[PDB]
Design a protein around this motif. Structure first.
Motif, PDB file in Angstrom:
ATOM      1  N   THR C 134       0.395  -1.236  -0.138  1.00  0.00           N
ATOM      2  CA  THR C 134      -0.203  -0.028   0.277  1.00  0.00           C
ATOM      3  C   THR C 134       1.093   1.281   0.113  1.00  0.00           C
ATOM      4  OG1 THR C 134      -1.975  -1.264   1.446  1.00  0.00           O
ATOM      5  CG2 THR C 134      -1.946   0.679   0.827  1.00  0.00           C
ATOM      6  N   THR C 135       1.823   1.173   0.313  1.00  0.00           N
ATOM      7  CA  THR C 135       2.958   2.617   0.488  1.00  0.00           C
ATOM      8  C   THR C 135       3.937   2.022  -1.520  1.00  0.00           C
ATOM      9  OG1 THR C 135       5.276   1.260   0.563  1.00  0.00           O
ATOM     10  CG2 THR C 135       3.874   1.512   2.488  1.00  0.00           C
ATOM     11  N   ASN C 136       3.771   0.997  -2.160  1.00  0.00           N
ATOM     12  CA  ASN C 136       4.232   1.236  -3.237  1.00  0.00           C
ATOM     13  C   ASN C 136       2.884   1.631  -4.226  1.00  0.00           C
ATOM     14  OD1 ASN C 136       7.151  -0.099  -3.686  1.00  0.00           O
ATOM     15  ND2 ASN C 136       6.535  -1.787  -2.995  1.00  0.00           N
ATOM     16  N   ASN C 137       1.852   0.918  -4.160  1.00  0.00           N
ATOM     17  CA  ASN C 137       0.673   1.954  -4.603  1.00  0.00           C
ATOM     18  C   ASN C 137       1.278   1.004  -6.486  1.00  0.00           C
ATOM     19  OD1 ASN C 137      -1.667   2.640  -3.803  1.00  0.00           O
ATOM     20  ND2 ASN C 137      -0.499   4.261  -3.590  1.00  0.00           N
ATOM     21  N   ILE C 138       1.857  -0.188  -6.566  1.00  0.00           N
ATOM     22  CA  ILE C 138       2.300  -0.235  -8.004  1.00  0.00           C
ATOM     23  C   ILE C 138       1.334  -1.384  -8.598  1.00  0.00           C
ATOM     24  CG2 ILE C 138       3.141  -2.567  -9.068  1.00  0.00           C
ATOM     25  CD1 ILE C 138       6.256  -2.212  -6.996  1.00  0.00           C
ATOM     26  N   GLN C 139       0.021  -1.998  -8.185  1.00  0.00           N
ATOM     27  CA  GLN C 139      -1.368  -2.122  -9.253  1.00  0.00           C
ATOM     28  C   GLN C 139      -2.264  -1.878  -9.263  1.00  0.00           C
ATOM     29  OE1 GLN C 139      -1.896  -6.158  -7.742  1.00  0.00           O
ATOM     30  NE2 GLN C 139      -4.221  -5.964  -8.257  1.00  0.00           N
ATOM     31  N   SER C 140      -2.413  -0.740  -8.514  1.00  0.00           N
ATOM     32  CA  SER C 140      -3.080   0.285  -8.875  1.00  0.00           C
ATOM     33  C   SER C 140      -2.316   0.869 -10.278  1.00  0.00           C
ATOM     34  CB  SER C 140      -3.318   0.752  -7.762  1.00  0.00           C
ATOM     35  OG  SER C 140      -4.491   2.667  -8.289  1.00  0.00           O
ATOM     36  N   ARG C 141      -1.122   1.644  -9.584  1.00  0.00           N
ATOM     37  CA  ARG C 141      -0.389   2.499 -11.194  1.00  0.00           C
ATOM     38  C   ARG C 141      -0.700   2.067 -12.677  1.00  0.00           C
ATOM     39  NH1 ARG C 141       4.384   5.093  -8.805  1.00  0.00           N
ATOM     40  NH2 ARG C 141       4.372   3.226  -7.607  1.00  0.00           N
ATOM     41  N   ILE C 142      -0.363   0.847 -12.220  1.00  0.00           N
ATOM     42  CA  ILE C 142      -0.060  -0.465 -13.726  1.00  0.00           C
ATOM     43  C   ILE C 142      -1.915   0.077 -14.316  1.00  0.00           C
ATOM     44  CG2 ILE C 142       0.018  -2.967 -14.072  1.00  0.00           C
ATOM     45  CD1 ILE C 142       2.550  -3.088 -12.921  1.00  0.00           C
ATOM     46  N   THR C 143      -2.626  -1.316 -13.146  1.00  0.00           N
ATOM     47  CA  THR C 143      -4.169  -0.952 -13.852  1.00  0.00           C
ATOM     48  C   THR C 143      -4.215   0.558 -14.264  1.00  0.00           C
ATOM     49  OG1 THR C 143      -4.388  -1.366 -11.828  1.00  0.00           O
ATOM     50  CG2 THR C 143      -6.096  -2.767 -13.375  1.00  0.00           C
ATOM     51  N   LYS C 144      -4.002   1.967 -13.523  1.00  0.00           N
ATOM     52  CA  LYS C 144      -4.780   2.887 -14.365  1.00  0.00           C
ATOM     53  C   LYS C 144      -3.860   3.131 -15.232  1.00  0.00           C
ATOM     54  CE  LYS C 144      -5.176   7.770 -12.930  1.00  0.00           C
ATOM     55  NZ  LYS C 144      -5.167   8.726 -12.110  1.00  0.00           N
ATOM     56  N   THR C 145      -2.325   2.777 -15.749  1.00  0.00           N
ATOM     57  CA  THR C 145      -1.866   3.163 -17.098  1.00  0.00           C
ATOM     58  C   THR C 145      -2.118   2.038 -17.924  1.00  0.00           C
ATOM     59  OG1 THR C 145      -0.319   1.030 -16.643  1.00  0.00           O
ATOM     60  CG2 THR C 145       0.238   3.687 -15.887  1.00  0.00           C
TER      61      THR C 145
END
Lengths: 91, 404, 211
Positions: C134-145
């Motif tokens: 939840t500090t990374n926000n990798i998956q949410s950023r990747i889904t947004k792109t």
């Protein structure tokens, strides 16, 4: 040019030197944490771990190359920075 | 003012056949006096420091212009009713225009609020505004943690108090979690401590460790300052797991202390059901997992009881639409435990708790949609589970309604 | 800081084994990368090599060397000893470039850029399963792109294929709340498949691959 990635530089031959709302993407609304539910088990120095400031803070998404031809930001060669925060590195 | 309105007032008084120039002469005189007073009532509003223009400002603006703030009645005598006001008339446009004279007597009077007191706090400490609740708020360099050492020490003290070695320490730490305004930017480390704790605390079913963590979740939720639905996804499994998981310790005794856990836990889950709600993500997902826990075959009598409780406090309509077509299965499960004959397993205790909870829910589900007629043997059409005792529970609910 | 000659030689042999002289030396090099205990102090060199090599695809659209670099990343992920948390910001846009770029081929019609698409999509689903915090926000950023590349029109059928492939390898709830609203877009696809007039272009193979 002579640092890590010199092989790539030599091969190139360069010689100088509403569904977009933020909530939709929160992982409570996009994950199966129902599997995480377990049915049957069978400080003069900061105690908390320190995370990579670049990963935690930096925008690594400016390096994503979306279109090779039309790439919005001109990229530059990256110098090795040898972060000393990481243990397992002698220096 | 509309001239048509002045004509209505004139002909409802005995002055008929008024000209338009006579009627226009009335509505520029009285519209000036409204403008003269509202400009003069704005002086009392600006000298009030209230920027409100209350109902009393026009009472002093009228008295300033030597007109009685007498409203609705005018005394040509003046002696009994001088420039003291009567507070206006509490009248509405959508009013009933007729009330019963004993309706006004029997209603309870409103509470007189607290008197004015003088509390001091600190707007600024040597230039910096504190975040108290009275205020609005090549080698790369060696990085620093985003928490201060006072904040990190605070986190260590609050977490070592919230594992409940002493009860007064817990209760303060829980109130500290419940109202610290600066508890954001420490919330990832609290959510991770909760989540990680329950998962390595159900490896051995340590009930206090879990009851303290559920109270920590409840203390995290009612804090108004912090933004929780970024950690809502992490929170849902931990609160849900304590309620329906198997108990590695002793199921038969600390059964009730485990049902008390399931209660303070149903509180955090109920907050999750009521808050954080968007379309078809959170409430329907936990409802689907609860229903496939129920329709599950040969489910543990601990998991079964916990899931039954979880589907039970889903509110008014949820038991109105879900618990209805399943009474026969509940009765068959109770009959199998009764057949036994071995009572060694926790199955009998689980069965008794499940049946009692289901019977109480069915009682109001019935008290709510139907009259209390034939409360003796009509419930035998529903396998005769609660029957007359269910009818007595409905009667107690009716008595509580009469008391209300 | 500078690599000792031992690990300089190891870096040279391992990187030149994954350029394509033969397949057996490549398989032994990837089984070295996946199963050695002490490859730290050579992780930044491998990350730089991989990210610059995926960048060098724009000068030479080599599908084969991109498949080799994606198998290098997949071998780097399977190593239990080394932690890629500090270097994942370099490997994420390289795999993303292998997913959502439009020319992955030298001859667009016959080269199966399609597999480097679903292989790199499986790779990025693994890289945001193991590392998303939840500090990374990798998956949410990747889904947004992926989402703003898919919902936005003018995008080519190759990059829409990559977006749909990554979004569908993320999981079931993602395709519930991202793919299923735009199922009407299939009609806009079948506008150019069942019905012409142009047929001999390269849009038809990509469109029915997307389908």
């Amino acid at each position: 040019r002579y640092g890590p990635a010199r092989l790539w530089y030599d091969m190139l031959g360069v010689p100088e030197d509403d569904l977009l709302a933020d909530e939709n993407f929160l992982m409570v609304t996009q994950l199966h944490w129902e599997d995480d539910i377990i049915w049957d088990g069978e400080p003069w120095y900061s105690i908390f771990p320190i995370d990579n400031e670049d990963l935690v803070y930096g925008r690594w998404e400016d390096n994503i190359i979306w279109d090779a031809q039309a790439m919005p930001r001109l990229l530059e060669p990256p110098v090795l920075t040898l972060d000393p925060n990481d243990e397992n590195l002698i220096l | 003012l509309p001239s048509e309105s002045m004509k209505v007032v004139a002909e409802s008084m005995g002055i008929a056949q008024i000209q338009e120039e006579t009627c226009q002469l009335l509505t520029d005189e009285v519209s000036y006096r409204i403008k003269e007073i509202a400009q003069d009532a704005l002086k009392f509003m600006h000298m009030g420091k209230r920027q409100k223009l209350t109902t009393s400002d026009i009472d002093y603006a009228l008295k300033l212009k030597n007109v009685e703030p007498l409203y609705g009645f005018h005394a040509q005598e003046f002696i009994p009713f001088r420039f003291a006001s009567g507070g206006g008339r509490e009248l509405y446009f959508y009013e009933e225009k007729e009330v019963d004279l004993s309706d006004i007597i029997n209603t309870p009077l409103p509470r007189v609020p607290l008197d004015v007191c003088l509390k001091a706090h600190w707007l600024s400490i040597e230039g910096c505004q504190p975040a108290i609740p009275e205020n609005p708020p090549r080698l790369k360099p060696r990085s620093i943690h985003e928490l201060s050492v006072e904040q990190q020490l605070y986190y260590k003290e609050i977490t070592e108090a919230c594992v409940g070695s002493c009860e007064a320490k817990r209760a303060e730490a829980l109130q500290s979690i419940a109202t610290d305004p600066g508890l954001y930017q420490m919330l990832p480390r609290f959510s991770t401590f909760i989540s990680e704790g329950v998962r390595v605390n159900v490896v051995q079913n340590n009930l206090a460790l879990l009851i303290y963590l559920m109270r920590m979740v409840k203390a995290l939720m009612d804090n108004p300052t912090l933004y929780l639905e970024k950690y809502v996804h992490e929170l849902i499994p931990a609160v849900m797991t304590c309620i329906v998981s198997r108990q590695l310790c002793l199921r038969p005794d600390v059964d009730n202390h485990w049902a008390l856990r399931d209660f303070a836990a149903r509180l955090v889950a109920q907050i999750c059901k009521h808050f954080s709600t968007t379309t078809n993500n959170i409430q329907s997902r936990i409802t689907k997992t609860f229903t496939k826990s129920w329709v599950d075959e040969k489910t543990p009598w601990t998991t079964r009881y916990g899931s039954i409780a979880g589907l039970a406090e889903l509110g008014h309509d949820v038991i109105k639409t879900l618990i209805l077509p399943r009474l026969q299965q509940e009765g068959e499960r109770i009959r199998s435990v009764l057949d036994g004959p071995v009572l060694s397993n926790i199955d009998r205790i689980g069965a008794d708790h499940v049946q009692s909870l289901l019977l109480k829910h069915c009682a109001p589900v019935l008290a709510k949609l139907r009259p209390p007629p034939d409360n003796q043997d009509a419930y035998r059409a529903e396998f005769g589970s609660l029957g007359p005792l269910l009818c007595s529970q409905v009667v107690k609910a009716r008595a509580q309604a009469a008391l209300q």
